[PDB]
Amino acid sequence: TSKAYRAAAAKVDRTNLYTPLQAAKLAKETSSTKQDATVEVAIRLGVDPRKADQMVRGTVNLPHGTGKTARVAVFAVGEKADAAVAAGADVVGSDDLIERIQGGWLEFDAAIATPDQMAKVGRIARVLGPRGLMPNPKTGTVTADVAKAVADIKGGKINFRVDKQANLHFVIGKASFDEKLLAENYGAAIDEVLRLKPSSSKGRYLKKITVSTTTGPGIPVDPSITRNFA
RNA sequence: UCGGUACGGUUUGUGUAGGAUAGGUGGGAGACUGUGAAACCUCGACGCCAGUUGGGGCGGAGUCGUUGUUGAAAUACCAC
């Protein structure tokens, strides 16, 4: 509501549909005013989450990561210590990793355990739960295959979830990225949202969609172009 | 003049507190030029939820932005 608020993207038009080629350009020009932040994508789906079978929940593999450091703490014992450090996780724990979590050493981003440690994970997730650093088997951060479980956090697969009022929330990374590296992250989601379209979504599926990143209005994005994201 | 629809803008709700968990939901350490106890709308209905708020007819003139997560996102206020 300031002068610098309207100075950011003072040239974007409301009554003009923009391609993702043009939306990647204006996302750079929106970032020309303020500091670095996380690019946010808002999609208005044409679904109804009142029915249970029309609930939309999935994931997508981004080609260019997520713009996060993604430090991974691994409950690694036995052969798990050699297979977790070979993937990219800087923290290789042990059986005594319980004391290092409740003792004041929280310098990571996600905790990934092994089934030989799952009898002791229940004393951990009470302090990493609301912080967002707890192990979760429902989202793919608890498995015995630690060679690719670490690559799940390193790959940057964003877990989106449609709300009570049929709206999506997706991220493609930082605002200081290239226009081509953000076009492949953005083009991969819509390549996989339509694959997870429910079988009883009446009307037009992806009706309204916008991308804004740094302290301004939303770019009017065109739903009608789903072939030329790059 | 009285309505219906589409699009666009503001505002209203929240057992319980510091912006009545500043609605629901996701992002998120940077947004603001700010004396504000206060005079000029006494928040612009409402003044019951109890203090939401005078959002600038002040002053670009500097000391309420930052801060407590103790509540079923509180915050670093917005990318709905």
HEC letters along A186-217: HHHHHHHHCCCCCCCCCCCCEEEEEEECCCCC
CA–CA distance, A149 with A144 (Å, rounded to integer) = 8
User: Do A218 and A42 touch, CB atoms closer than 8 A?
Assistant: yes
Which of the nucleotides in strand B have any atom less than 7 Å away from a protein CB atom?
8-9, 23-33, 56, 60, 69-70, 74, 78-80
Coil, strand or helix at A48: coil
Planar angle of CA A221, A14, A10, nearest 5 degrees: 105
Q: Which of A114, A102, A169, A106 is nearest to A147 (CA)?
A: A114
CA–CA distance, A206 with A186 (Å, rounded to integer) = 14
Q: Which of A62, A19, A40, A21 is nearest to A184 (CA)?
A: A62
CA–CA distance, A12 with A30 (Å, rounded to integer) = 9
Spatial strand order in the sheet of A38-45: A167-174, A38-45, A206-212, A219-220
CA–CA distance, A166 with A68 (Å, rounded to integer) = 27
User: How distant is C1' of B4 from CA of A167, in Å?
Assistant: 27
CA of A35: nucleotide with nearest C1': B30
Partner residues linked to A73 by β-bridges: A91, A111
CA–CA distance, A64 with A114 (Å, rounded to integer) = 27
Token pair listed for A158: 């964003």
Q: What is the resolution of this structure in A?
A: 2.8
User: How distant is C1' of B48 from CA of A148, in Å?
Assistant: 58
CA of A160: nucleotide with nearest C1': B26
CA–CA distance, A170 with A212 (Å, rounded to integer) = 11
User: How distant is C1' of B17 from CA of A135, in Å?
Assistant: 33
CB atoms within 10 A of CB A181: 17
